[PDB]
Design a protein around this motif. Structure first.
Motif, PDB file in Angstrom:
ATOM      1  N   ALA A   1      17.050   0.543 -28.131  1.00  0.00           N
ATOM      2  CA  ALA A   1      17.255   1.942 -28.432  1.00  0.00           C
ATOM      3  C   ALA A   1      17.414   2.712 -27.034  1.00  0.00           C
ATOM      4  N   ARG A   2      18.129   3.678 -27.084  1.00  0.00           N
ATOM      5  CA  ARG A   2      18.372   4.409 -25.632  1.00  0.00           C
ATOM      6  C   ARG A   2      17.140   4.977 -24.903  1.00  0.00           C
ATOM      7  N   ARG A   3      16.509   4.203 -24.088  1.00  0.00           N
ATOM      8  CA  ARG A   3      15.601   4.813 -23.189  1.00  0.00           C
ATOM      9  C   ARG A   3      15.671   4.106 -21.871  1.00  0.00           C
ATOM     10  N   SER A   4      15.312   4.959 -20.862  1.00  0.00           N
ATOM     11  CA  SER A   4      15.172   4.166 -19.547  1.00  0.00           C
ATOM     12  C   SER A   4      14.126   3.278 -19.640  1.00  0.00           C
ATOM     13  N   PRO A   5      13.772   2.255 -18.584  1.00  0.00           N
ATOM     14  CA  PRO A   5      12.964   1.110 -18.880  1.00  0.00           C
ATOM     15  C   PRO A   5      11.563   1.878 -18.699  1.00  0.00           C
ATOM     16  N   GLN A   6      10.661   0.887 -18.889  1.00  0.00           N
ATOM     17  CA  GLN A   6       9.328   0.859 -18.411  1.00  0.00           C
ATOM     18  C   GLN A   6       9.182   0.362 -16.974  1.00  0.00           C
ATOM     19  N   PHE A   7       8.119   0.925 -16.183  1.00  0.00           N
ATOM     20  CA  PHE A   7       8.218   0.364 -14.815  1.00  0.00           C
ATOM     21  C   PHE A   7       6.929  -0.637 -14.673  1.00  0.00           C
ATOM     22  N   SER A   8       7.094  -1.201 -13.423  1.00  0.00           N
ATOM     23  CA  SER A   8       5.843  -2.152 -12.862  1.00  0.00           C
ATOM     24  C   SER A   8       4.747  -1.279 -12.407  1.00  0.00           C
ATOM     25  N   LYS A   9       3.562  -1.779 -12.686  1.00  0.00           N
ATOM     26  CA  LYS A   9       2.332  -0.977 -12.290  1.00  0.00           C
ATOM     27  C   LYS A   9       1.346  -1.822 -11.758  1.00  0.00           C
ATOM     28  N   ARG A  10       0.410  -1.165 -11.062  1.00  0.00           N
ATOM     29  CA  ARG A  10      -0.591  -1.566 -10.484  1.00  0.00           C
ATOM     30  C   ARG A  10      -0.316  -2.381  -9.249  1.00  0.00           C
TER      31      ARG A  10
ATOM     32  N   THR B   1       0.461   3.975  -4.153  1.00  0.00           N
ATOM     33  CA  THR B   1       0.057   2.941  -3.447  1.00  0.00           C
ATOM     34  C   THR B   1       0.275   3.153  -2.078  1.00  0.00           C
ATOM     35  N   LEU B   2       0.494   2.204  -1.035  1.00  0.00           N
ATOM     36  CA  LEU B   2       0.008   2.142   0.113  1.00  0.00           C
ATOM     37  C   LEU B   2       0.887   0.910   0.798  1.00  0.00           C
ATOM     38  N   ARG B   3       0.803   1.174   2.302  1.00  0.00           N
ATOM     39  CA  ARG B   3       1.224   0.050   3.104  1.00  0.00           C
ATOM     40  C   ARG B   3       0.249  -0.135   4.414  1.00  0.00           C
ATOM     41  N   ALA B   4      -0.373  -1.323   4.674  1.00  0.00           N
ATOM     42  CA  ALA B   4      -0.805  -1.533   5.909  1.00  0.00           C
ATOM     43  C   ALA B   4       0.009  -2.952   6.326  1.00  0.00           C
TER      44      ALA B   4
ATOM     45  N   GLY C   1      -5.784 -10.899  13.866  1.00  0.00           N
ATOM     46  CA  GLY C   1      -4.788 -10.390  13.043  1.00  0.00           C
ATOM     47  C   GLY C   1      -4.810  -9.710  11.577  1.00  0.00           C
ATOM     48  N   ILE C   2      -6.077 -10.142  11.159  1.00  0.00           N
ATOM     49  CA  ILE C   2      -6.474  -9.754   9.700  1.00  0.00           C
ATOM     50  C   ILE C   2      -7.353  -8.613  10.026  1.00  0.00           C
ATOM     51  N   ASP C   3      -8.353  -8.438  10.940  1.00  0.00           N
ATOM     52  CA  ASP C   3      -9.372  -7.301  10.999  1.00  0.00           C
ATOM     53  C   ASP C   3      -8.357  -6.267  11.101  1.00  0.00           C
ATOM     54  N   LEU C   4      -7.033  -6.239  11.012  1.00  0.00           N
ATOM     55  CA  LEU C   4      -6.097  -5.117  11.354  1.00  0.00           C
ATOM     56  C   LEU C   4      -5.528  -4.853   9.851  1.00  0.00           C
ATOM     57  N   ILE C   5      -5.596  -5.521   8.961  1.00  0.00           N
ATOM     58  CA  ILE C   5      -5.125  -5.132   7.478  1.00  0.00           C
ATOM     59  C   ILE C   5      -6.436  -4.351   6.620  1.00  0.00           C
ATOM     60  N   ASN C   6      -7.645  -4.730   7.164  1.00  0.00           N
ATOM     61  CA  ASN C   6      -8.839  -4.042   6.753  1.00  0.00           C
ATOM     62  C   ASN C   6      -8.851  -2.583   7.471  1.00  0.00           C
ATOM     63  N   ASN C   7      -9.371  -2.679   8.921  1.00  0.00           N
ATOM     64  CA  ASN C   7      -9.550  -1.639   9.539  1.00  0.00           C
ATOM     65  C   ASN C   7      -8.211  -0.534   9.839  1.00  0.00           C
ATOM     66  N   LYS C   8      -7.299  -0.735   9.006  1.00  0.00           N
ATOM     67  CA  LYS C   8      -6.244   0.175   8.702  1.00  0.00           C
ATOM     68  C   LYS C   8      -6.553   0.740   7.090  1.00  0.00           C
ATOM     69  N   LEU C   9      -6.682   0.148   6.102  1.00  0.00           N
ATOM     70  CA  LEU C   9      -7.134   0.423   4.784  1.00  0.00           C
ATOM     71  C   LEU C   9      -8.376   1.253   4.845  1.00  0.00           C
ATOM     72  N   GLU C  10      -9.140   0.945   5.840  1.00  0.00           N
ATOM     73  CA  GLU C  10     -10.583   1.956   5.692  1.00  0.00           C
ATOM     74  C   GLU C  10     -10.127   3.155   5.798  1.00  0.00           C
ATOM     75  N   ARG C  11      -9.717   3.606   6.937  1.00  0.00           N
ATOM     76  CA  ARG C  11      -9.254   5.178   7.282  1.00  0.00           C
ATOM     77  C   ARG C  11      -8.347   5.631   6.185  1.00  0.00           C
ATOM     78  N   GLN C  12      -7.572   4.900   5.607  1.00  0.00           N
ATOM     79  CA  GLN C  12      -6.733   5.194   4.610  1.00  0.00           C
ATOM     80  C   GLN C  12      -7.383   5.811   3.383  1.00  0.00           C
ATOM     81  N   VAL C  13      -8.005   4.987   2.796  1.00  0.00           N
ATOM     82  CA  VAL C  13      -8.967   5.114   1.517  1.00  0.00           C
ATOM     83  C   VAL C  13      -9.959   6.471   1.910  1.00  0.00           C
ATOM     84  N   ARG C  14     -10.523   6.325   3.166  1.00  0.00           N
ATOM     85  CA  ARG C  14     -11.441   7.467   3.462  1.00  0.00           C
ATOM     86  C   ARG C  14     -10.948   8.795   3.372  1.00  0.00           C
ATOM     87  N   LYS C  15      -9.816   8.851   4.260  1.00  0.00           N
ATOM     88  CA  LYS C  15      -8.736  10.292   4.003  1.00  0.00           C
ATOM     89  C   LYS C  15      -8.519  10.676   2.493  1.00  0.00           C
TER      90      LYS C  15
END
Lengths: 128, 143, 110, 84, 99, 101, 60
Positions: A119-128, F61-64, F74-88
RNA sequence: AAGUUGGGCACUCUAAGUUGACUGCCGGUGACAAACCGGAGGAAGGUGGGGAUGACGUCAAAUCAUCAUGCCCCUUAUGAUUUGGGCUACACACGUGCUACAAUGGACAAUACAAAGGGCAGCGAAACCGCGAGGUCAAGCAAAUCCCAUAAAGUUGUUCUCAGUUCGGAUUGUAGUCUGCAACUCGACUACAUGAAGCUGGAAUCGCUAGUAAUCGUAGAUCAGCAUGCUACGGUGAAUACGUUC
């Protein structure tokens, strides 16, 4: 006799309407409409040309229709008749075209296209 | 943005009944919705021998509020609700309060309900009230 | 009981009161009730001793008992024992064609 | 299914009809995929190329929902953590 | 009871102009011609993807035209026989002679 | 969570290490449904250490991202980015209420 | 592998069906018609050349 | 019997050229002008419907495994033929979607309306066989002709009377049909029985401004065989749009 003519087109359902003066009596391809269209008890609205134009009536009906199911087929009835009454005399465009009856609303089923599923509906999205 | 006229209902030469069918017209199957509705007519027009339009206009006016509210953090305001949304409101609380009756048949719960609010009973008159309780409880912090 | 089989219902129509017994479905109904020329009509056991001749005679003509749990027991001890490439799969929840078990909790797997 | 009726590879048949007269041999390397049961293949013991190598079996009377197309489930332990 | 043919062109004028020049050949030594009777010109489709590897949703459509064009003439003389078999170009038509 | 890594076979000490150090941030707020990581190796010819990661959020969602010599720094950097992110993301927000009329 | 799959398909068979017809130009096996024996992307690759009608585009 | 026969091309319908909708025209408004609202006609009046079309650049985005190709490397092999497995296993999660949790319902029997495409040894017509799958011969056909085909939902009467139900048909096994030599790991489909959770789903979260959403079916590719997928076609047919707080 003298059978006026109007010709209606909705939803693949052409309505070669052979209107003629007389009593008013239906033959959907050599068959009354009442039993025919499921169910259906919406035929008041089909004599609308008689409801509002040269009201009451009546003029006698022969009609050669085919295509689609009842609905748009039961809507080319109107444009068939009203176009046949403007063909009879456009005297009452000022009570027809106040109800339209010549606007063959050209809306239809658009093409299919990506994403459309069972039936005509836009998809569901990926999540989390 | 305008609102999709119904010509008339070709039953009763009315309008409101179609406005209700379209809320009952599940699957677009008006045949079965106007079925179950016509059944509704003969049944309710049998019980307490009367018309639809009497129990209909009665009970549709018995649940229909004249106020309801809305939020805008979220502060909930009193407003005289506009009429057509008030119409579909009565329609909607009607039917959605209807099906939860725990009753088998298409129609008996319906006529039970319109007959309910016909005597100023039923939970849709009740929600009308609570709407009119929050409202005038909602005058202080928002009006 | 009552006539035979196992546990005839009470105040249920014949055409499915039959369907309750271990190994009666739907077409089976019209068969075995036609073999006595009866009708149910409508939700309810409607019997007297009159047609008991044919409803009691016909019902004896089939293996509507735990002998079908016996013959079942034979079919399963058969299939499982042979080698059996379908005796390991007798348990996975697989018909003869395989079933690609990925979604299966299941109704047929623990 | 089969279309009336059972078939066999027939190059194995050339083997069994050869080993069928004397005190019947019970050692077979073979292929045994499109070869279904019938009781001339008895007196003889079958090790079928399983997918990697050949794998014996003592043929036995109860072999009715069974055939030699494979009798070693080849997914090879299992593939799975749990057992059956 | 007359010649009848079927023309299939993939450019929608050559049917018409070819039809009329061969009509001219046909009525030159003859007469009684029925015209280019249109047939619905059925179509085709090819649901092709705008990709190489993935992104299946971003796709597009090539299609096709298959026209049929039904032309006759009655009361033969062997000179309108030659009107059939005198001029055939542009030969992208699927010309088929019959009666 | 979702961890696909090209041109390398993953191990387990990195798993407890990285994911535990990410778990430290339930100070705010974890909220731990998905955590997609991403890697690759890439000749330069000094020749790589790709350290890329999502840390997606409730309703967003996000990106580091980082490239390094080595996976620890190199990993201490995927962390000490997300920290400041979540904080704000938690500061924010807006309460300084204020009557009206 | 590829180069010898090319010879695999066109040499003989045992019987009717253990055989495929991929695309001539590209070796694209999957999702290919039997009308012209031409893959997904060879037709696009040679649709723009416009040798054939062909149309391209967007009426349906 | 019949648009079948003779007749007619009137009319739907038919594929090519033709206008018509261009704020074009009228009224109001506006810095007069740009321009906004309404009116008239009109089928369409406000970039008519929808598609085609994706500016500069961003993602060292995907692609050497479409194709080609810079560098490297193999070459008695990382190259090759041959048979068999297997790419499909599942304690697990996830994502995806399909299907029930029923009385507008479920099951029975009669009945009507679609569009679009495909077809040569291919579409399979009757008659015949059977529970059905399917098979007998072959009517007709390179197609607005003959076939796929029959439409489904609907509607018509019957009954079921709220159940783990005439819901559910998963499951397991019994028995047949079609395919290819080949249905174990691994094709579906046909009658028998078995009849699970599931009685509308928590927190969470997604699409949609009208023939939409929602809903019933049809056919094309891939194709020996194979679609809860995709694609195209239709038939049925809603609520909401105050205001841009947020």
């Amino acid at each position: 006799q003298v059978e006026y003519r109007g010709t209606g087109r909705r939803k693949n359902s052409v309505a070669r309407v052979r209107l003629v003066p007389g009593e008013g009596n239906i033959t959907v391809n050599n068959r009354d409409v009442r039993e025919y269209l499921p169910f259906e008890s919406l035929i008041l609205d089909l004599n609308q040309p008689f409801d509002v134009t040269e009201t009451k009536g009546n003029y006698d009906v022969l009609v050669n229709v085919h295509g689609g199911g009842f609905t748009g087929q039961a809507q080319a009835i109107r444009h068939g008749i009203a176009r046949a009454l403007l063909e009879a005399d456009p005297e009452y465009r000022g009570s027809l075209k106040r109800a339209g009856l010549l606007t063959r609303d050209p809306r239809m089923k658009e093409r299919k296209k990506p994403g459309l599923k069972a039936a005509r509906r836009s998809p569901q999205f990926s999540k989390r | 943005v305008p609102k999709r006229d119904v010509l008339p209902d070709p039953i009763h030469n009315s309008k409101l009944v179609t406005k209700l069918i379209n809320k009952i017209m599940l699957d677009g199957k008006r045949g079965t919705a106007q079925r179950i509705l016509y059944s509704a007519f003969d049944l309710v027009e049998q019980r307490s021998g009367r018309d639809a339009l009497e129990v209909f206009e009665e009970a549709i006016n018995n649940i229909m509020p004249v106020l309801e509210v809305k939020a805008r953090s979220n502060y909930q305001v009193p407003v005289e609700v506009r009429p057509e949304r008030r119409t579909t409101l009565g329609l909607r609380w009607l039917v959605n309060y209807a099906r939860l009756r725990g009753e088998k048949t298409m129609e008996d719960r319906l006529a039970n309900e319109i007959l309910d609010a016909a005597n100023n009973t039923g939970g849709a008159v009740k929600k009308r009230e609570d709407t009119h309780k929050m409202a005038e409880a909602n005058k202080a912090f928002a009006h | 009981a009552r006539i035979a089989g196992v546990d005839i219902p009470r105040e249920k129509r014949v055409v499915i009161s039959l369907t309750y017994i271990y190994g009666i479905g739907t077409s089976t109904a019209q068969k075995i009730l036609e073999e006595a020329n009866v009708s149910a009509d409508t939700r309810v056991k409607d019997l007297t001793d009159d047609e008991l001749g044919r409803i009691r005679e016909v019902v004896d003509g089939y293996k509507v008992e735990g002998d079908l749990r016996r013959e079942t027991n034979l079919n399963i001890k058969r299939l499982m024992e042979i080698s059996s490439y379908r005796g390991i799969r007798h348990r996975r929840g697989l018909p003869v064609r395989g079933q690609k078990t990925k979604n299966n909790a299941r109704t047929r797997k623990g | 299914s089969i279309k009336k009726g059972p078939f066999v590879d027939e190059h194995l048949m050339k083997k069994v009809e050869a080993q069928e007269g004397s005190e019947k041999k019970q050692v077979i390397k073979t292929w045994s995929r499109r070869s279904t049961i019938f009781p001339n293949f008895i007196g003889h013991t079958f090790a079928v190329y399983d997918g990697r190598k050949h794998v014996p079996v003592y043929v036995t009377e109860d072999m009715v929902g069974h055939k030699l197309g494979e009798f070693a489930p080849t997914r090879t332990f299992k593939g799975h953590v749990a057992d059956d | 009871q007359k010649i009848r043919i079927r023309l299939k062109a993939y450019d929608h004028r050559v049917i018409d102009q070819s039809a009329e020049k061969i009509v001219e050949t046909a009525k030159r030594s003859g007469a009684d011609v029925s015209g280019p009777i249109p047939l619905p010109t059925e179509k085709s489709v090819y649901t092709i993807i705008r990709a190489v590897h993935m992104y299946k949703d971003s796709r597009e459509q090539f299609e096709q035209r298959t026209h049929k064009r039904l032309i006759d003439i009655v009361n033969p003389t062997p000179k309108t026989v030659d009107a059939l078999m005198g001029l055939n170009l542009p030969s992208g038509v699927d010309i088929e002679i019959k009666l | 969570f979702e961890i696909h890594g090209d041109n390398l076979t993953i191990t387990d000490a990195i798993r407890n290490y990285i994911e535990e150090k990410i778990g430290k941030l339930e100070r705010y707020f974890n909220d731990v449904p998905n955590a997609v990581a991403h890697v690759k190796v890439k000749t330069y010819s000094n020749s790589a250490t790709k350290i890329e990661v999502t840390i997606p959020l409730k309703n967003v969602t996000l990106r580091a991202e980082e490239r390094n010599d080595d996976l620890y720094a190199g990993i201490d950097l995927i962390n000490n980015k997300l920290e400041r992110q979540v904080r704000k993301y938690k500061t924010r927000i807006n309460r300084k209420s204020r009557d009206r009329g | 592998a590829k180069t010898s799959m090319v010879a695999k398909q066109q040499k003989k068979q045992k019987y009717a069906v253990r055989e495929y017809t991929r695309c001539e130009r590209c070796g694209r096996p999957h999702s290919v018609y039997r009308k012209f024996k031409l893959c997904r992307i060879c037709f696009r690759e040679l649709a723009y050349k416009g040798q054939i009608p062909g149309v391209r585009k967007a009426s349906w």
